[PDB]
Design a protein around this ligand. Structure first.
Ligand code: SF4
Ligand SMILES: [Ca+2]
Ligand SMILES: [Ca+2]
Length: 355
DNA sequence: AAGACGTGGAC
DNA sequence: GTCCAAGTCT
């Protein structure tokens, strides 16, 4: 970027950003902990989604030390519905590491900060530049799109050769006077003007520096690979109540998909032997007798890498003794306390409507 | 590496 | 209905 007017670019970009900067709860100060929380929440989650989640999370957990001293089940419930739940398990372990090894002080050296769980190349850049003014690039989806258009990068943005190149661009053009504002400005440009479809080049403050605008190839950039079809997984789900009114739920294991979350009992059903497969599964628990009615709904629930096809079977349960872990009976009132994945919150809504 | 890992805003 | 978001794990 020898022929690039970095200083002219920075002036127009930072002048735009001051005018159009959105009022977001994590922009009210530069507390390293609060910045870190917002940036983790923001990973692969849109700003408008994150806003109410951040507001409530910081209410329950106002300080790094409050999050460290808290129980993992309360931490998980405060993320309920946001998706990619290991972010919060990672964040929770990381803040414990900071309380121990670092005296509660978020490290300001990138190598030490990046070593914390949950902190990748994007989050090192975003937290350190905002909270401490470290000139580290914060290259997210927004930035990759903007830079591939400004500088006509035609290579798949998923390659490391391309990532290293975006990083090297940011180090050349960044305003080392205010690296936090520079990083948040490039992102904000990608979010509000230089958008994935139909970018607003005519309202763009840096139109005169953009190579894709000049060549008329903006909407063809960035280069990303089309998504390949994902496996469909049939799943039978039982909503079982008893004479007293309590419902049978169970806690998922701590490894893999939707870990440590609660669900209604379920099982894979290649074919349509779900009424049978469920009865065989519930009865295999100690002193548990069960009889299920016909299904009441079937809906899909999408994950990034697979798609669940849920069928809900109501039923009733008789227990001759204590229900063995991982299972548990819960009155309908106590359900709102447990953390459920979105799929199973909908299972429950469809069962209450049916009744 | 590759693939696992959630959900919904914004068209 | 489709894309992709203020990505990271190891
Ligand atoms: S002129 Fe258009 S393509 Fe170029 S940076 Fe601005 S919005 Fe993006
Ligand atoms: Ca790291
Ligand atoms: Ca498991």
């Amino acid at each position: 970027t020898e022929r690039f007017p970095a200083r002219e670019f920075q002036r127009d970009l930072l002048d735009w950003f001051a005018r159009e900067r959105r009022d977001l709860p994590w922009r009210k100060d530069r507390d390293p902990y609060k910045v870190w929380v917002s940036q983790v929440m923001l990973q692969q989650t849109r700003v408008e989604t994150v806003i109410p989640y951040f507001e409530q999370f910081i209410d329950r957990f106002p300080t790094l030390e409050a999050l460290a001293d808290a129980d993992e089940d309360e931490v998980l419930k405060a993320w309920e519905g946001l998706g990619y739940y290991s972010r919060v398990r990672n964040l929770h372990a990381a803040v414990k590491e900071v309380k121990t090894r670092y005296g509660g002080k978020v490290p300001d050296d990138p190598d030490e900060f990046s070593r914390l769980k949950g902190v990748g190349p994007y989050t090192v850049g975003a937290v350190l530049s905002l909270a401490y003014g470290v000139p580290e690039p914060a290259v997210d989806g927004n930035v990759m799109r903007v830079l591939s258009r400004l500088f006509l990068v035609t290579d798949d943005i998923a390659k490391p050769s391309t990532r290293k190149r975006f990083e090297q661009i940011v180090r050349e053009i960044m305003a080392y006077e205010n690296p936090g504002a520079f990083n948040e400005a490039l992102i904000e440009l990608g979010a509000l003007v230089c958008t994935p479809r139909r970018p607003s080049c005519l309202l763009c403050p840096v139109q005169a520096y953009c190579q894709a605008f000049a060549e008329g190839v903006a909407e063809e950039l960035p280069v990303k690979m089309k998504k390949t079809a994902v496996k469909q997984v049939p799943l039978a789900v039982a909503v079982l109540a008893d004479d007293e009114g309590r419902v049978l739920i169970r806690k998922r294991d701590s490894t893999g998909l939707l870990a440590n979350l609660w669900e209604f009992p379920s099982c894979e059903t290649d074919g349509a032997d779900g009424k049978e497969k469920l009865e065989q599964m519930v009865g295999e628990q100690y002193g548990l007798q069960v009889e299920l009615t016909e299904p009441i709904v079937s809906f899909e629930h999408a994950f990034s890498h697979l798609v669940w096809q849920l069928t809900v079977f109501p039923g009733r349960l008789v227990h001759g003794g204590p229900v063995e872990e991982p299972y548990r009976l819960a009155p309908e009132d106590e359900l709102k306390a447990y953390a459920f994945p979105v799929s199973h919150q909908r299972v429950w809504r469809e069962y209450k409507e049916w009744a």
